[PDB]
């Protein structure tokens, strides 16, 4: 998460913002970060009937979606509602049985979204969190999750602000990252024009001085930077998306047969799955 990039854009670079219905999106491949979207579905078994109904409903919608999921998160972290471990096992199996193509993101899910996205076999990633788009996604969609969906574009976001990515990364790390902390007393506001002027953070440390601006203790944003810049990443060329016809009766062993859900409610909902399969990759 970038602390305030969201309301940033909006305010001195809108043109990035392009406001759409899901019903244009039809038959459009986005790459659908797994663990921010569980976030969204536990506002109990909520996150799998949230992932099994949102995803036809996506499907349905023309929307073909590919879920990516968490790996071992990276060393640097301590700077700074709970997806577990089982939340992604369930989903996952579930995707599984559904003919959903999932996969299993080497470290950070936005980051391998991002990739699908620079490589160009997806045309965007859906998430809410905005630090996908340090990872350097050309677009990021938001509210894919009643609301409308944010289309946002990093050339843009580039080209209206004058940094290059690297500049970028270091105005995210200045708004306030996941993994080091910012300067304090710095508003978002005064980061960009402090970007735009001086370009890095080594350099405006320089031109701040260390008592009425003090930074973070041994304060590792140059590490920040690197995991931003050079994330570890899976590789999309090797990588292969397959929407499958899902396998029903194993679906219900699986939602009913484990998971105490309703059989003809969980059958109608594989059948307009399946249907719909048939309008977008009928082949
Ligand atoms: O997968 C995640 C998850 S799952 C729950 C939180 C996160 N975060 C932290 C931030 C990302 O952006 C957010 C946007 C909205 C609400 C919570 C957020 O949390 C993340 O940065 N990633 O990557
Ligand atoms: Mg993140
Ligand atoms: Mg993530």
Redesign the pocket.
Same mark, same amino acid.
């Given at each position: 998460? $970038?602390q305030g990039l969201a309301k940033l854009i909006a305010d001195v670079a809108p043109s990035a913002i392009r406001e759409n219905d899901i019903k244009s999106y039809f038959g459009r491949k986005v790459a659908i @970060?797994a663990?921010?979207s $569980?976030?969204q579905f536990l506002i109990t078994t909520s996150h799998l009937m949230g992932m099994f109904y949102r995803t036809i409903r996506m499907m349905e919608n023309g929307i073909k979606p590919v879920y990516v999921f +968490?790996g071992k998160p990276p060393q640097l972290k301590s700077g700074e &509602?709970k &997806?577990t471990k089982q939340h992604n096992d369930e989903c996952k199996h579930l995707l599984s049985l559904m003919g959903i193509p999932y996969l299993d993101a080497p470290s =950070?899910? =936005?980051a391998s979204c991002a990739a699908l996205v620079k490589a160009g076999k997806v045309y965007a990633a859906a998430? =809410? +969190?905005? +630090?996908?788009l340090t990872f350097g996604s050309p677009v990021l969609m938001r509210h894919l999750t009643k609301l409308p969906i944010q289309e946002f574009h990093l050339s843009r976001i580039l080209q209206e602000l004058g940094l290059n990515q690297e500049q970028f990364v270091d105005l995210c790390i200045l708004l306030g990252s @996941?993994y080091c902390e910012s300067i304090r007393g710095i508003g978002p506001k005064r980061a960009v024009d402090l970007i735009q002027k001086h370009k890095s953070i080594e350099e405006i440390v320089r031109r701040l001085d260390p008592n009425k601006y003090p930074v973070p203790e041994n304060w590792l944003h140059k590490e920040a930077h690197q995991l931003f810049l050079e994330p570890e990443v899976l590789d999309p060329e090797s990588v292969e998306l397959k929407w499958s016809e899902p396998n029903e009766e194993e679906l219900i062993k699986f939602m009913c047969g484990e998971k105490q859900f309703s059989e003809e409610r969980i059958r109608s909902g594989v059948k307009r799955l399946s249907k719909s399969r048939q309008g977008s990759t009928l082949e």
């Open positions: 998460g $970038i @970060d663990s921010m $569980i976030y +968490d &509602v &997806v =950070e899910a =936005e998430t =809410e +969190d905005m +630090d996908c @996941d």
